[PDB]
């Protein structure tokens, strides 16, 4: 769990790299087909949800 937040999904693959969690979430969103502007613009709301 600690690894996921700090390093996202990168550590399982190899040595962990530190990335911002907000940025990490954005990368996952792209996977689902939603651009990054959507996550950042609605970032305040998403945290609450």
């Amino acid at each position: 769990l600690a690894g996921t937040i700090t390093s996202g999904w990168t550590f399982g693959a190899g040595a962990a790299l530190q990335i911002p969690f907000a940025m990490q979430m954005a990368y996952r969103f792209n996977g689902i087909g939603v651009t990054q502007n959507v996550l950042y613009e609605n970032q305040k709301l998403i945290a609450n949800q």
Partner: peptide, 25 residues
């Protein structure tokens, strides 16, 4: 580019360069 600069958090002032303008001038 999709928005206003105020909405995003942690955005840093910087200059973005366009290749097209130089050639036009």
């Amino acid at each position: 580019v999709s928005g206003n600069c105020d909405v995003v958090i942690g955005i840093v002032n910087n200059t973005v360069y366009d290749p097209l303008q130089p050639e036009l001038d």
